[PDB]
Each structure stands twice: as structure tokens, then as C-alpha cells.
Design a protein around this ligand. Sequence first.
Ligand SMILES: NCCC[C@H](N)C(=O)O
Ligand SMILES: NCCC[C@H](N)C(=O)O
Lengths: 452, 452, 452, 452
Amino acid sequence: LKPNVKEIPGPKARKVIEEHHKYMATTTNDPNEYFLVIERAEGVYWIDVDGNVLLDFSSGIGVMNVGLRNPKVIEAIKKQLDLVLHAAGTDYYNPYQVELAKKLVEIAPGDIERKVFLSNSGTEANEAALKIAKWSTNRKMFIAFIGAFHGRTHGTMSLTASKPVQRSRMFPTMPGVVHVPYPNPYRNPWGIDGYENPDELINRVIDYIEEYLFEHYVPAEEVAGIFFEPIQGEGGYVVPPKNFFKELKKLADKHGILLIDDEVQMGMGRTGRMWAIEHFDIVPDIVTVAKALGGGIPIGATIFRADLDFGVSGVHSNTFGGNTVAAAAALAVIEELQNGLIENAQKLEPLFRERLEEMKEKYEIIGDVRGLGLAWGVEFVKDRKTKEYATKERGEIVVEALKRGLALLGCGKSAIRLIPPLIISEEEAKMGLDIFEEAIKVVSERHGYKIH
Amino acid sequence: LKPNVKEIPGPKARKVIEEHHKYMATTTNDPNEYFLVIERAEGVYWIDVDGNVLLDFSSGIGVMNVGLRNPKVIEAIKKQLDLVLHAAGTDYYNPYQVELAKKLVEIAPGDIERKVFLSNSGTEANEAALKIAKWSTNRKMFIAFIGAFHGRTHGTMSLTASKPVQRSRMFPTMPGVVHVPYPNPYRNPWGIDGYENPDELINRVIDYIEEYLFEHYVPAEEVAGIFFEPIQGEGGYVVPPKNFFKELKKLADKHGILLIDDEVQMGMGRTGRMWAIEHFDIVPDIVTVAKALGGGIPIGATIFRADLDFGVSGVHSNTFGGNTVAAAAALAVIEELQNGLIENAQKLEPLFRERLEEMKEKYEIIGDVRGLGLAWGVEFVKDRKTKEYATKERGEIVVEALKRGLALLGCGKSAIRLIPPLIISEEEAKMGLDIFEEAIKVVSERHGYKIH
Amino acid sequence: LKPNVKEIPGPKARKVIEEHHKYMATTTNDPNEYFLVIERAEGVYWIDVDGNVLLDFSSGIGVMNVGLRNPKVIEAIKKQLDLVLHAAGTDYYNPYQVELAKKLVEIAPGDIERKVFLSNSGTEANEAALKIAKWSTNRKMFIAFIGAFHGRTHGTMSLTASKPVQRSRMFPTMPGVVHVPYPNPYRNPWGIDGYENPDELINRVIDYIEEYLFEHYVPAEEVAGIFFEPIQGEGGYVVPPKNFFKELKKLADKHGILLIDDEVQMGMGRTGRMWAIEHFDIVPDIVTVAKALGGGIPIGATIFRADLDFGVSGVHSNTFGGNTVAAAAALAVIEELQNGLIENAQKLEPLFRERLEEMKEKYEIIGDVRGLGLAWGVEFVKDRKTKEYATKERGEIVVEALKRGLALLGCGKSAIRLIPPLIISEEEAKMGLDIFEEAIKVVSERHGYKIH
Amino acid sequence: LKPNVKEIPGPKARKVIEEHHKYMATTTNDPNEYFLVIERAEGVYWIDVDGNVLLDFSSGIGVMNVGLRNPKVIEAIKKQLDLVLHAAGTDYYNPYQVELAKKLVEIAPGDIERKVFLSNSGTEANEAALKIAKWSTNRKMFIAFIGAFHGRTHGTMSLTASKPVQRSRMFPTMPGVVHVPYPNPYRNPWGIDGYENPDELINRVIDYIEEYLFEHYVPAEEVAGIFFEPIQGEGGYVVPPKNFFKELKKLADKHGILLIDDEVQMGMGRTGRMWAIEHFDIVPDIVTVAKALGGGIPIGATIFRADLDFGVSGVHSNTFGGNTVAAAAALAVIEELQNGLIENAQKLEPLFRERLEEMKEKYEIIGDVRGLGLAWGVEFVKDRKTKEYATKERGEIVVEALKRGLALLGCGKSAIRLIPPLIISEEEAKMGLDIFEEAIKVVSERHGYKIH
Ligand SMILES: NCCC[C@H](N)C(=O)O
Ligand SMILES: NCCC[C@H](N)C(=O)O
């Protein structure tokens, strides 16, 4: 298998897209920018319904970290199918869900007392985090960051602050969430270069919470939790300054506020550590995970300080939580990560840094590149001084990559995320970066952007 | 296989239960009333980790309708694992999710045009219903019924009114939900026998909404939706009067209010129709399903009138939605249902009605039996006049059934649900009802309840 | 002065009404049902701008208890205008507000220690009660009754459940209020005659709270307070059964819930006790008063158990609170009340009961008469069996009374309130009841209602 | 009368303070910083209960703009007392309330169609503004400014963002308010000197609303209104840049958002214009007023664009609104303002600017002085570089002014407001500024602050 694309979308792709439009609700599907219609998958490749072969830099939005069709994950699933699929994890007991909980407790950041609540998705895991924090602190308010993405349920829609269309006609959602600027080193209300001056940007974000919220309208004692992504995902693959979470933890600790680390996108080895928060040297009170945990099967986990546990039975539960097929898949995922995929993300890191810095030097349309491990963000701007979003052009780069056999996803208003499966070879990575560079070059030439 | 129980919980079960309490959050597991630790399943039987063999009358809380471990569903999953697992159904397209959406549209109640939003759970399917209703109507309030269960997320916790511990320290959840009494023919605020006088009970509930809410504090024009279970599940397997939903729909239509039918527990053939609402001759605007749809793989679906679609992209989305493995499972489930399992529910309905009415005649501790298809509730009371809940006795009956190789679940404060897989034979069903009756006899004799 | 009416509304009245509609917001003024344009007042009489003279049975919606224009109250105001008007009672101190606070503490129901928060209105007094209850209990939910009126501010609009137009497009107001049926002995969801069977109605309301709210969706421990009117005013002058509040207090005490008695309309001597709750033999935790307290100057007061005080400065405050002119007026009002006006209410109670029961015997259009002291409600119905509201007829009776020189107000959907100033003579009262009866006779004859 | 103070608090003052503490709720009274106990008032002087005479620079928190005891206001009141006090302004009509509404429509900023809703206080007037805006736009969200003060009711507590103690245990209040930094030229999150660079600070506040809120989590189309004070009062007498409201109006107009101008403290001539918004050259959609409007009698008004009017009767109302004593007082207040008090505020302005700039040059403890007309703020800091709040010292300056016969109020964390009645003479103003300078000098010497 190698990238090989003729007509896309082909006739079979166009037929499915038409049928999708007829029977399915309008969500985030784009017939003009995302015309990929997947039929099957092999190693790091998609094969679409017309036989087109595409190199995967999407991981299906950071879910297929261990590969598009991991054989070790599939064996575990088939083995679990011969035993039981659903055991009603929350009314009856089963050993598969308990074996996963024991492993998640062990691999949790830091070395503190942990328990786990299992669910079916990232948004469920964040909803469970909200409930654990409310119950354990008896506090009802939360702080979240502008640009955040935590899910689309009534609780998590209040935490999410990515695109206003996410909230259109939804008000009122869960009350009690206040938002403050993320320490985005490329775009922040202070105009601070947070790469050159990380401490200045850290102090402005901390000062905003302390002076602007705590000293005026948000009683610090009534805040249950601060929710954060350790790198903002949907918001643009935004990597905050290295010392930010240490300063955030000093502020939270002074007021008895929990730190809630959303690893739904950046966890499960994506940054060359089991958790992205590991690069920032703090131990969050709650960690939420989903997506890559189940290696393609729906699963969520909320890993929390043990003493936060619900005092009584029946405060939270679900039907599908502790799903044995999901539990089997996740145990197989974690062993793959620990046996070389995390190390492979650390090894590939400098290839991604070097090539993307080379692309920033050469192509003016690139405002910023940023990343850790195999989580990389490239933001496109009309002008490096105004930083006006190159949204049209970003979309065209994705489309040109597809035509050349590379599957990419946009993030934020004008960025692209590069998130290839952690099984990707050096040679597969170089090929995808070369195709990515060609798509930028094409759209740069087509719009007259400087090429140095 | 036959019901065969020695010590339960056995030594391997006790080890799992202790590990569960150590590593996992406190939810709805009960070491005292539900000490069932499942290792595998075969036909209508659980095999626990100590080799005990139990006849299943739980169906994993109404999820395993097509049997504890269906070969057609397993075959379809294995076939799907060969092609792909996750294709990012909400960014990219794939034919598998579209095939399921088309089928759900076709089997939806009534003959109006529909679309589908796919999710991972019942609570997600109901959160999507909230969002669809708010967007499409531009109204923000909802009516739900006392005793309802719709899920534990911030939006669905406001809809749910089953047990107050479900809300403990969670206020505020999503504002805007008002609750009114369910037309429960055994227990209602008016003292009405809703079996003997159904129209009187219907009329009291309808008049409570019109006279008490609409004419006093709830502007009818601001209500987006009325959420209902067609039989309350977690609330006690409560079957409302046959004409109630017709009268509810007249009131809703008068005010432009949507009807949202929660079929998460009563759907997928349980009541001897594909949808439980089909017994009540209305066409709801929105139908939610989960649990049984995936035959053991987590899935949810929100089926709605096509003109309620989100008019713009990015209002609602999910990661795992349109999961290809769940979709393959769901199409298999629907084929099995349409090709014989629903007919089986229809055939065994009279055996349950006959056996449960005989038990009610013989055992004074039984206050009420009610049901449709293979959905049966039996409610235990201390005295048939007071209808004082026999909560302790109900728990003792579940334990005595389990010791004798029958897995039952409680529902409401003093009821038991009988929900065996729809593949159950007449002989297997008779074996179950016999054990259930032996358990009732034992607990009656212990406490001095009359046996006629 | 005697009732004397020629044209109403006369030419000067019509000019004022037209100017009102041009310059002022649309509220609860009614050019068709309430065309009374007041120029001055003398004793128990309004003199309108065209010189019409009307006997007042309105008391300015229960504000002018001490008479339409009391000389002792006017003397005290004039004396206070000589010294000071506003002294900023919440930053600086003054002896006038303190003298009133001391008096209110002394005349509060029961013999427990109290403190007082002074405000400008009934809605302010009730918003202060919400804040006192939330702070002192650290709980956030409230129970209120269907038919209640507590004010139109964002906190009190959630408590109020009188007419849905009061809430139109205002959602969301303050979250956390659940409503249950009032023990209205004439109209209730159970169809109970609460006059003949008061304990049955009490028991249904108490059981609705315990069984339907506490045992299903409202955690009793999270309820800060139960708000009630001791007689519902705007809801129809509805007198609940004499033992209801005693049973309500048992339920509240069991759960640590405060009792908040809204006396804004029924206090200051109206019912022939200083507080209407004194008829029902309980000591509420919080009492709110306004309207009549100031004898025509805006004032409100929130009287509470001293141990509910805000433990810290700056939680609640106001500008005009402890206004010295209002305080001087209020002390005068309380002296007049204690020195004869409350005795007058006691003396005239039997004349109202006798005359209104005679009217109920004679006029079939009257469904119900109810009252205490000088607080009387008469409810008009199309048919004594259906109790269909005679809303049009009720409005016609108010208009026919006005044409004959009696000012009445509607209450609820088809009732009239009789609330004459407490200085009214037996002769003046008889003149009023005679005009009221003539108005009922006229509207009965017009529509063919039986006259026995 | 001249400032003459011996012992303060004297024995009679100490007795009232003790009694206040016994019978009245803990609010914003300070026995240690505000020991003034007012007995009567004359011209611009308080006389306390021990015969101490103090020059008034407080106006009783901006209420006594026309004087402590205006004779023209008192005559109007006594004249209205001979006619009627309360006419039930919202059920019946009266010419006094209509004459006030007609005058408020006329004096409203700009020349656009207006109507008026009358209430009893600033917080009621702001609550009415929230309801008018919600009803007229059918939008439920609001933007308010950090540092804002709009009242302590459930609606206005959401708008208020001055001290977190104002909200202690009150959550949840009315949902839907988002807060952004005020353009405070002395203290803002960008560290911008807004005196030297007003356009830079304006653009940062506008950009924060547009880029940070509108482009991320606050759909601009769902915002009913932006609430602002034209000078922040309780927050510190903060005067925004001259062009700020023109830029705010361009932003609001682009999205159909209302501008709601809170003049409860800065209106009724205080800044040498009838309204403070007049200095900023925009025409707000809604204007709220109270305090000084009633010249010492409780009153509120909400003046709004006529087409916003409530479409139906019964959405908003009150009992005491249109109170004829209040209406008479307010008509007399407005005539005093228009006949020379507003002009007197313009005349005294440069005396206040010159003396306070002289004090800033001389006393290092002064960080900032700012003001318009007779509204002036002096902010005290420990260090002019850190701007650390000199809260202890601010309180001591107030106390030393009192001992020397000047009544001052603190504002914000370390400011003092100078708000003398608009009837103050040049000679009275110089005397109060000389006493104010002596109090600063004393506390400067006492703490070692530089005196240049
Ligand atoms: N993982 C976050 C984004 C995934 C999905 N397309 C959504 O927008 O919900
Ligand atoms: N005018 C605003 C402040 C007035 C009062 N002391 C309060 O804090 O509420």
C-alpha cells in the first residue's frame, strides 16, 4: 500500500455522501472539504469505497493511536466476543472492567490514590468529572478556558468555548461556568509572544483569574474545579507554556479547587508520554480519557483522586460502562503503547519539529507551528503581522492533500493538525510531511503567498 | 445448560467484588443484593466466575434482547473488524453508519420522513433529543414525568425523576424542566384505579398539565418538548392507560410542543412491537434508542422528523458516532428482531400474563402485575390497602431467586422486572417463572404473608 | 362624602388614561375594567379627577389599611420632613430605622429572637428572604405553591405561580424553585371539598411534597425554604385549612427547611390579627411585609430568626433601606393598628361573613365566599358543578360596582376581593356590601343566572 | 452651621450603634469606619444625635443631589400629602405618575421615542430593564463589566461584579450574564494607561468582546443587552475613555444588542449634565434611574425606546410604582436641577479638578484622581508603581475627615468618592477640599508617605 488517488470523490463516494445527506442529521460533515468515504483500513492507510489509498495523518480525530486496524486489539476483541459482550457493568460485576480499572489506576499521572469511573465517550467522562467534582467539594462553579473543547452534552457545552455555533439556541446549559483566556502563545488578549516570553503570558492568565474573577464576581471558595486541555485540540493544537500548569496548580491549591485534565484527545501516548500533562509536571485531581483508549471501540474513563469518590450508591452510573469488548480492546491498546508506540512518538518528534520549522522558514502562509510527540498544529494566516485567519486557504490545503493521498483534519479557524497513528514508520512520516509541504506549496503558488 | 448454583458469591466472585470496590467509583453495584460476577454467557444463561449457571431474566438491563451472546451479531462484528472499526463518522463519511441510519428511518414509528443522529448511549441519545428540540422550536422548556428515567448527564438528570440520590449535590443541572405525575394506574396522587378507570386517570394528568402548569406558571408556547417513557422502566415497569398518549398528543399539538418518546429500555422488540409506543397508536416527533440496538456494543440513536434537522453545521457532533462495529451489530440485531425474535415476544406474552396473574391470586405480598410482550413488572407491598412498599422483601426475593439460578433486577422502590432475552423458549420461561414463584413463596413464609 | 358617580370615566379621566398609554409601559392597568383615575382621598373614599366619589373596597391593593389618607401617618411624615428624609441607612446609622426594626421584632409572630432587613417593596422583602435562606442554610432550592404571588423580580418571578403572562419570555429566572398545589379548599387537583374535609386536603398536599417530590426528584436536604402566603391574594383570596401550616412545619422541621411566610398582602392587621399566620398557630422562620406597613410610603421588611443573620458584611444591602420618612410612617401605622384598627377588623368580620353567605344563598353565579377579618374573596362560576370560571361576568360585576360608586379589584381568574380600609364604619361597610350585591344582581339578570 | 465635631461617636451615637447591631441584619454598616449617626440635616450639613455638625461630601450615596433637606422638594411632598399618598399606580390611574413619566420621557438622553416604567429603587429599575430587554429582543443573555454595580436582587446580582462577597452562597442567580473588563484607565488587564492612550484601551475591551466572546462561546445574536455604568460608582468612581461608548454602540448595533445605561448613581445632574452618558455622546436604548430622582423618597424609573414596550398586560408591574408622594418629589427635583443645580456642578468642576490635581502632585499616597462635574474619585495606593491597594489608609482618611467634620464614603478597594450636594457653594466646596487634604496629610505623615 502507498498513497494512490485518481478521481475523489469517485462515483461510489458521491452516492454515499448523497445518502448520508438524506438520512443523517447535519453535524460537522463537509461534502466540499471532507469528501473522504472510508471502506476499510490497513496499517496507516485508508482505502475509500472507490479504491483510493490515503496515508492517515488524522487518526480519525485522535482515536486510532495504535493503528487504523491493530491486529493485537482485534484479537483481544474476537477473544472477548467468544466469552461475553455486555454484563451490565453497573448492576452486576465482571472481571474485564475491573482489570481495566486496575490498569488505569496504575498508569494515572503521578503516584496518588486513584479510582476510575467507566463510561462510553469523552463527553460522558467529562460529565462524570463535573459530577465527581460537585459531589466531593459540595461546590457548583467551574473555570474553563476560551478555545476549550470538552464535549457537546448539556454539562460539557458550558465548559466548551471553541465555536459559538456549538451553543446556538442551546442556552441555558449547565449554569456556573466562567471562561478565561487560555495561555495561547500565538494569540492572546495581551498580544504576548508566549514562545519568547512564557512567564509574562502565564502571569497574565493567572492574574486574570485572581484579580479579575476572584477579587470581583467569582467567589474562589465556590469553585469546584478548573477544566483544561493540556494542549487545546479542536481549538487549534495550542501548546501552552511549559510552566503554566504548575502556576495554575498553586492558584487552585490556595482555594481548594480541583484540577481536571481533559486527555480525551492528547492522552494515550499521542505526545510521546502516556499523558500530555506529563510534559507540564503536575498531578491532576481528575483525568478524563476516551477515543484512543478503546482502539476503535467506544469507551470513556474518569480517573480521580480516590477520596473524591461518591459517598453513596446511585449518584452516577450508566448501562454500557465497563462494556467487556471495550475493556478487552483498552487493555490491548495500553500494552501496545507501553511496548514501543509511546517511544516511537518520542523518536519521530524531532522529524516533525525539523520539517515543520523548515516549512515555516520557507512558506509565508504558515503563521505558527507547534507540537509535542506526534501531536502537531500548523496555523495558516493571510499576513504574519495581522494574523488574519487563512480559513479558505486552510481548507484548500486539506483538499489538495487528499487529492495527493494524505488524510488531514482542520482545527480551529485556520489550522491543520498532523496526528498520524503512533505505529507510523520514519519513511511513512517523511512521505506524509512531503505531501503536506506540496499541498502548502500548491495553495501558496495559487494565492501568491511568498515562498522564501 | 440449566440453572445450577452452589455457593454464590463463590470465592472467585468475592475476589472480583473486593477489587471492584477498591479500584472503581461507587455507583449502583450492590454486593448484598446483586452478587453476580459474569465470566461468560451462552444462549439465555450467565456462567459466573465460579461456574454457577443462571437463567437470565435481566437481559443486562434490557440490552441483550437478541440473546446474551448472539452468533449473527458476533459474525457481523468479526466481519466488520476485518474491514474497519472507527472512520470518524462526523468529519469523514462511511457507508456502514448510513446503512444503519436508512434502516432506523424505515422502522421508525409512523410513515413521516425522518433523519437520525447516532451517538454512544441512551443519555447521549436523549441529550441529542434535547438539542434537536431546542434548536428546531427555538423554545427552552421541557415537561417530563415523575418516576421518569432518561439518563445521568447534566441535561438528562433534569429530565430524570426516579430517585433523589441521582441528583444529590448536582443542582444546578439544565434549567427549564417541569415534572408532572405519570398516569401510573397502581400509584398516583388521585388514588385512581387506572386499570378500572383509565380515562379518569388520563384526564387528571392532562388537566394537571393544562390547569396547574399552563394556566399558572408554565407558558405553553415556551415548551419545546414533552419527554416520556411509553412504559416507565427504572420507575417500576409502569404501563400507562392505552389512550394516554393520544390525549397527550392533542395537548402537545394545540401548543406546538414536540413529543419525545424515550425507547432506550422498551424498544427493539421488547414489548412485541419494534417500538413500545406502537401499542399506544401515536407517532412521536423524536424517538431515542440505545442498549439493545447494538446487541452488546454501545450505541445510541435519535430518530426525528426530518424538518427538525439543525439548519447549520457544528450545533451537534460526537467522535464515536456512526462507529462501524456498532452499526454492523445493530443491522444484525434488527434483522434477528424482524425475522422471529419479536414474534417470540408476542407468543410468550400470554404465558407471562397467565403465570403472573396466578401468582397475584396466590401471594398476598404481590400488589400488582403489569406488562406487554416480554416486559413485566411485579410490585410487592406490605398490605394491599395501604400499598406500603415492601422494599426489604423485594430485595430478599431477588437474593432467593439468585441462590436458585435466576438473575432478576429490582425496579422502583418495591418492584421486580422480568425481561428475559427475546430468544427465550417457552420451557426456559416456565423454568424462570417457577423459580420466581418459589422465591416469592420463601419470602412470604418467612414474613407471614398469606398464601391463598 | 357618599358614593356619588355620574359619567366614569369622565372627560378628565379619559385624558389621563390616554396620556398613561402614550408615556408609560404596558403593565396591569385596564382602561375597560379599571377606569378609576384618583385625584384625592378622604376617609374611606376616592375622589376621581372628574369629582366622582367612590367607596374604597380596594385599599390600594391592601396598602392603605390605616385609611386612604390617615392624619396620624401624615402628621408623622411632616414631623420627619422637618428633621431628615434619607440618611443612607446601610452605610451610616440613624435612630428612626432602628426604632422601626425594634418594633417589628417585638410584633413578629411567636416569642423567638428576630432581626430585620428593611427594603423598599414586597418583591425586595422576598428577594432578601431568598438571600437570607440561601446564606444561612447553604442550600439553594425552594418550594412554592401553585397560585402564589411573591413579586416580579428575577428571584421572586421563580416563586410566583399566579398567571403565566407574568413569566412570558423571562425564562430563565432564578433556578431551583419547585411548585406544588396549594391546599385550595374550593379548587384543587384531587376534587376535595377542603371546607368539609380539610384533613384529607392537607394530607394530599403534604403527601404530594413527601411522596412525589422528596421520594423522586427533589432532595429534601437541598431545600433552603418553603415560601407561602397564609391566604393566597392575587390567586383569589384563598383561605387554606386551619391545620395546614402546622402539618407543613412538621415536614419542614424533619428536613431542616425554613418556613417563609409572605404577609405582603395579608399582614398589618388585615385578617384581624397583626399577621395572618397567627390564625394558623405556627411561628415562621422568616416573615415578609410591605404595602400597608408604610401607610402609603414605599417600604418593605424581612423579619427573621436572629441566628439566620448574614455572618459577614456586604452579602445584602440597599440604598433607600431604613428610609426615615417610611420608618416614621410605619411606626404611626403600627400604633393606629394596635390602638383600634385591628379591633375594627375583628368587629366587622361577622357582618362580611353573614352578608356574603346570604349573597351565596341568593345568587347561583357565586360559587364560593371565603375570608378572615377584612379579607374576603367571592368566586363567580358559570355552573356550581363544573366550577367553570365566570371571568367575563366577574369583570362585568367590577364595572357595575364602579358605575355605582364602589371600587373593587378582581383576583384569580373569576374572583373579587373585598379589602376595605380597617377604619371603615359598619354603616360604610353595609353601603359597600349593598352596592356589591346590586352589581351581582344586575350581571346575574343580564346573563340569566338564577336568583333564589 | 459650620463643621464642628467634639467626641464622635458620642454617647447617643454609641447607644444607637449598639441597638442597630441588636435588631438589624448585618449589611454594609461599619461601626469602626462609619460611626456617623444622623439625627437631622440642613443645607449641606448633617447634625448627628450628639450635636456634631458635618459638611456632606456623601449625598447619602448620591441620593441628596438637590440638598439634604430641599425646601422645594418638602413643599411638593406636604402638598401631595394633602391630596393622596398611594393610588395603586398599576391597577388604577393617577395624574401625578403620568406627569412624572411625561417629564422623564422629555429629559431622556437624545430625541427618540420613549416610554417609562416606574418602580421603587435602582435594583427594581435594573430588574425592569432586564425584563424589557428579554421581552423585546426575545434574547436571554447579557454582557456586563467587571467592577459593575447594578443591585443585589437575583437578576441584578448576576450583572453586579464589584466584590465577590455580594454573591457569597447566592449561586445560582439569573443565568446568562457574561462579564468583560471595564475600560478602567488606571487598572486593566493590559496595563494600559487609558488617560495617555484611551484608543488602545477602548480597542482591547471591544476586541475582547468581539474576538474572545463572540468568536468563541457567546453567540452575539443571543445577547439581549450590554449593561454599563457611564462611570463605575461602587467600583471606584472609574471614568472610562470619552470615545468608549461610541465604539460599544457600533459593536452592539452590528448584532442588534441593546445598550442599557445605569444612571442610578451618576444621573440627575451629578456630572454637570442631566445624564452622565451625555459626556460620551450616545443615546442608550434603556436608561435606569433612582436615588437622586426622588430627592430622598424611594423611586425608580426605567426609560426605554418606545418600541421595546411589553406587547401584553401583566408581564411586569408593582404595588408602589407611580407612588404620588415620590412623583411629586421627583417633579420638584427635576425643576431644581434644570433651574441651576446642573449649571452649579459644571461651575464647580474645575475647582475639584484643580485642587485634586494639586493633591495628586503633593501627596504620594494618591495613585489617581478622576471625575466629571461633582462626581470625583481619589484612589489611594501603597506604591504608585505596584498600585497595591491602600485599603487600611483609605479607611483612616474617611475616619480623620469625620473627626474634622467632613462626611466621605469609600468606593472600591481603596478609593474615596467626593459627591457633595449640587447646591454646595464655592466656599463650602473649598472648605471640604481643605478638610479632605488635611485628612490625607495626617494619614500620609502617620504612615511615612512622601509629601512633595
Ligand atoms: N474531538 C472533538 C471534535 C470531534 C467532533 N468532530 C466534534 O466536533 O464534536
Ligand atoms: N449604590 C450602591 C451601593 C449602595 C449600598 N451601600 C450597597 O452596597 O448596596
